[model samples]
Target chain A: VTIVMIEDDLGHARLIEKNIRRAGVNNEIIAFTDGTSALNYLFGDDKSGRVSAGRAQLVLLDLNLPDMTGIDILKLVKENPHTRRSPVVILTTTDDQREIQRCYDLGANVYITKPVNYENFANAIRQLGLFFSVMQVPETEG
Target chain B: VTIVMIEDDLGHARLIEKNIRRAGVNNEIIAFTDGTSALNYLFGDDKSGRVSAGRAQLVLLDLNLPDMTGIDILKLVKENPHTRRSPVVILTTTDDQREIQRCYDLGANVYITKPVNYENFANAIRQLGLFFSVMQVPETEG
Candidate 1:
């Protein structure tokens, strides 16, 4: 399975990648810095949502993005038939209870708060990777 | 968050709980060997889905059960507005691709195959516990 990370912060992206690697998850990691390109990649240039056809993928989304809110991206992923089965994990600094609740309601598989402490964040991601290693993600239908 | 485990196999349940403890997850674990009692606890005696009101929970469900299939429990949990936000993790021995896809389509948060090897099963549960520790489950709405 591929790991599609949609995070605008390059430094945070690097940190996440580092920790996932440290946890021994060797899956392909595709990083996108903006929502538009990520959406195009996921939905295909034709906007037919066939980009993930026959592929198994998981998404790591950040709530704050330059192009749009992660919530919007999450909704689109869950709403689309071809991409709906893909698991989405929200990684963000916001720990607001309501926002966390909202994300779960919108179908996010896991929600992790990015602590300012890099050590804590890395540990959390490592744990997430451990869980990710055993997950059975479904292939997107063509 | 409470961990609600619904598995018919007592031995598997013990192994799961043991590994989760080994991974340092100290959350309250309520185990049920049947779907009927589990549903009653989740939906309340009145079946109004109020048992989990204001409670944050994560469900570990098994596909094979004596009284009912885990798919049925998954559907009811996801269908009830009050409990829809709770994360459901499908832990079963079945590895059928179709069933895995179906579970994700029906809103399962994670799917894990219970390997027959005791070492592998223990390792997976420990990893799952690590992830469970960081996950932010939503409180069921009253």
Candidate 2:
């Protein structure tokens, strides 16, 4: 299973990777600092032949990005049949109730708030790490 | 938050409830030993008025049931726009790769195998409980 984490913040991204590794989830994770690169990796390069398209996947998406918003990424992913089935877990600072509802409507698998407190944030990602440890990710079509 | 658990296995159901509680999650859980009663509650009556419709929901669905298969229930839930967003976690003994893929195709958010090893199963559920604590479930529209 490949976990796709799309976060622009260097500190937060490192913390998440650290926590995921600490909790013993050994899945190969592909990180993207911008939406365009992520999209290119996911859909642009002969989508059918993309590494992520045929394998089991979990997406950790951040809404606030330097370029295209993560919301657009979520929409496009879920709209594509082969990619839509990938479990999407949204990690963002945006806590607006409306935005939360909007993501769900677009088929997000899980929605999470990035904690402002560094201590609490790491602890939370560890919990997610444990979640990834035991949870079974479904495979997408080739 | 509301959690709906449907499992006919007597021992597994209790263990799930016990582990979830041990994780310190305070969300109310409604459990059913059969598919008939569960269906009656979810779609038969007062569905829109049900407390879970407006709130974030987590459904622990067992694919093997005494009556209607859990797959049937999964179809019904995911097909309903009001409940489609609810994260449905599937637990079953059969780990057939095809079954896992099918569940994901039907919109199951997560999949878990019911380990026969009691000690391991308990530990796994505890991880899920903690994941539930920090995880944010998106609000569903009725």
Candidate 3:
């Protein structure tokens, strides 16, 4: 299984990768700084999403991106037949109650608010990684 | 916020509770050995799911229940207007690939297979608990 990370903030991206590693999840991670490349990779050049078919994956998404909102990506992923099964976890700084509910309604597997406290944030990420290891990301069913 | 666990096996229930405590999650836990009472608590007498409205909740469900399938409960929860926003995690012994994908398709927030290895099972539950603490279970949107 592969972990795809869509994060624009370089510093936050680094911190997320470090904590996931600290928790001992060694899955290959494909990082993207923009939504365009990430979407291309996930949906393929044809935009059919067949490129990711049968590949077990986990997506780590940040709501605030340079090019687009993570909510758009989440909606597209869930609506697509080939990538809808892949778990998408939203890791963002947004704490708005409605935004959180909206993400869940849009099919986000998990949503974690990025904590301001450094230690707490690191601990939360590490714990999420550990839980991730236990999750069974089923291959996209044809 | 509350954790509503619906599992038939008493031993598994005990183990899950113990491990969650070990992970330092002190949230109120309401455990149900059957789906009937669980549904009543969540949906109330009218069964409109209004009882859980505006209350943040996380449901841990077991697929095989003596009275009914967890899939049934899962579908009802997701369909309800008031409880749709609450996170539902399927925790069961079943590892069927199609079943896993079906659960995700039906809006299960997370699906975890019960590991036979005692130590690994304990570790997984504890890790899930740690992640649970970090999750912001939004109050069910009106």
Candidate 4:
């Protein structure tokens, strides 16, 4: 039930984590501030501090990252044989149609545009956390 | 905002349509009981009956059809360049891992198992409807 959240903005990441926790989700969350570090942890060569590629239950990805675009990370995740089916939900502020289509084309399982208002943002994340609770991932099918 | 639902079961189709409407989704849902009629309506060669492929926002597809397996429909849908990017959510009773994997590999936007219990089934479809409200379909993107 671990959710790997890859968001660059520290404030938004903290708020998202808090709301998810408040939604009665007990899963351990692993948050990374940038795509590079997150990629290293996910597909890294080193054994230490590396999460198994198939172990993450879900991923909350942001399209706008300081180091690299989330689209690049998404392509890598979906193209890799081991993590191809992992459910990756796009959690970003951009509601641009092109970006949305691009993410879907790149194999994002869900695309959620983050609300600008604080309350709305928190509530949206909370509902997504609840969804994560009941929604079955493909890995669990077998 | 129309959703083309292709399902053969009368009872399941009624329940699915009812639940989707109950979720305050005003989108027009055209339910076809068989694949032949549905395909004709969607990809009709006749000038009078042929609806544009990209007109529908999403498709709620069932795997088991009276005329053909939903996988056949899926293949046709994904293979058609004009309709390939339309979001398809697979709503079926099959929990086979290979089936789920194959559907996802075939470019299904989402795969949800239909619950057996009457109440749970209704609730699941309602949640799916709500998900549809937030989900960004590829056809809408520029």
Candidate 5:
């Protein structure tokens, strides 16, 4: 699966990448530190583009972003016909039930809360890594 | 999260249960050997059913069934107001790209091919089991 991860936190981002690999997922992940850059890569025409345009991608979105909220990006993606069907999975520290529901309402395919306890968070990510081995994703049209 | 697994093959069903436990998922998996039984639990009236009707669940659906096609159940789940948002993960032998694409179009959240190779199938289920430890499900209402 072509995966895209957008996270402002450098630390969590690294941890996620490392752990996902540990789960045996071998796909290359395209990561962005800001929503603006990610938006461009997803919705903009690259004079030469950072990411391939036509492939359907699995998205790992963290709700908090440096420039804008991940929800906005989610909304944009879901509202757009081209990307609406791409599986958008929420991976964030926000464990609030309301926010979780909101993400699903906005059409997120999955929601994963990063546990506050460090051990718990690590364990969760590690567990998720294994899931990558078996999880199937929908294709995104070019 | 509670889970509902529907598979007609006793061998595959047992294998799934065994591997899911190995992946560290503690949630109870309510399995049905046929589509009729599962439909009763999800859409019929019964207290001592395989699963609670009011609880949100992750569905692991097999496309082939003795009585009905998995696609029929999927359509019902996605169409029902109470269960529409619940994540439905397709786990079956069908690796046909067209079938995979159809499942997504019908609102399946994920589609995993059960590898023909016995070892691969076991491994895939094990990976999915790990995913269960970190995945969250939406609430269901009766």
Candidate 6:
């Protein structure tokens, strides 16, 4: 399982990766710090990188990004035919009702709010990683 | 939180309900043996029942039904203006590729396959119940 972690904060990204690994997820996880770079790597015209468009099994999206909103990335990913079937799990700090609704409206498969405390956040990520182990991603025709 | 469970088999329904309760979900769960009865309770002309239409927080649907298929129920629920926002989780034993694709295409918010073995099935249902506890359901418009 290849998980695309689209988060801007380096520290949070590292923690998420570490917790996921602790939950026995041995699959490759590619982290992107910004929406633009992630978009370029996933849907870029030039396909010469390790992370190519439509290759990721799952996407862990953060709503707040330095470049573009995660909602926009989700729309792009879901609307595009090549990546429409890729499952996206929104892992964000915001518990805003409107934001959660917007993510679901844009076709996010799951929405999880990041806990404020470090221990709680780590435990949540670990549970999510375990969930990823059992959850089946829809097969896309790329 | 109220969950409307629509399943034809009484045995399966009992087990599902039991496991959901065992997972520490204290919310009210209304079970119906057929799609027709569940739909009527939700959108029927009669208003005598305690469970009103469009009041359910979550709907647990089984794909195979004696009265109607789960896909039909899903389509009706999604197409209806009043109940379109309600989250419907497809829980069944089907592993068919086309069925899975069709469920997602039909606008199922969540899809889960039931494990065949007794122990695994119970475990999976427990996990689903835990997920149900954390998942956010859209509020119904009165």
Per-model lDDT: 0.91, 0.84, 0.92, 0.78, 0.80, 0.77
DockQ values for all predictions?
0.85, 0.74, 0.82, 0.41, 0.57, 0.36
Q: How many Å off is the CA of B139 in candidate 2?
A: 3.0
- Encode model 4's per-residue lDDT on B57-134: one tens digit a residue: 688889998888899778877666556667777889897878887887777767778888999889888877766666
Residue lDDT tens for model 3, B1-142: 9999999999999999999999899999999998899999999999999888898999999999998999999999999989988999999999898999999989898999999999999988998898898988888865
Give the TM-score, chain B only, in order for the candidates.
0.97, 0.92, 0.98, 0.90, 0.91, 0.90
- Cα RMSD over interface residues, candidate 1: 1.0
Most lDDT-accurate candidate: 3
lDDT of 3 by residue, A26-137 (tens): 9999999999999999999999999988889999999999999999999999999989999999999989998999998898988999999988988888988889889788
Q: After best superposition, candidate 3 residue A48: deviation in angstroms?
A: 1.6
Write model 1 residue lDDT over B1-142, tens digit each, in one string: 8999999999999999999999999999999999999999999899989878888999999999999999999999999977888999999999989999989888899999898799999999998998887878789777
Predicted candidate 6 versus true structure: per-residue lDDT over B1-142, tens digit per residue: 5888999988899999998888888889888999888888676755233244335477889998998898988888767655655777788978786786677666676677877898877777777776665455654434
Q: lDDT of model 2 at residue B115?
A: 76
- Candidate 4 per-residue lDDT, tens place, A81-128, comes to 556667888989898878887787788878889888999888778767
The 10 consecutive residues of candidate 2 chain B with the worst lDDT sum are B44-53
Which candidate order results from sorting by DockQ in descending order? 1, 3, 2, 5, 4, 6
Q: In CAPRI terms, where does candidate 2 land? A: medium
**lDDT per residue (tens digit) for residues A1-118 in model 5:** 6789998899888888888787677888999999998888887764233243445688889999878999988888877656766788899987776787778767788899877787
Off by over 4 Å in 4: A21-24, A46-56, A140-142, B46-56, B140-142
Q: Which stretches of candidate 3 lie over 4 Å from their true place?
A: none
The recovered share of true contacts, given per candidate in order, is 0.86, 0.78, 0.79, 0.29, 0.65, 0.08
TM-score (chain B) of candidate 4: 0.90
For every candidate in turn, the CA RMSD to the true structure comes to: 1.0, 1.9, 1.1, 3.5, 3.5, 3.6
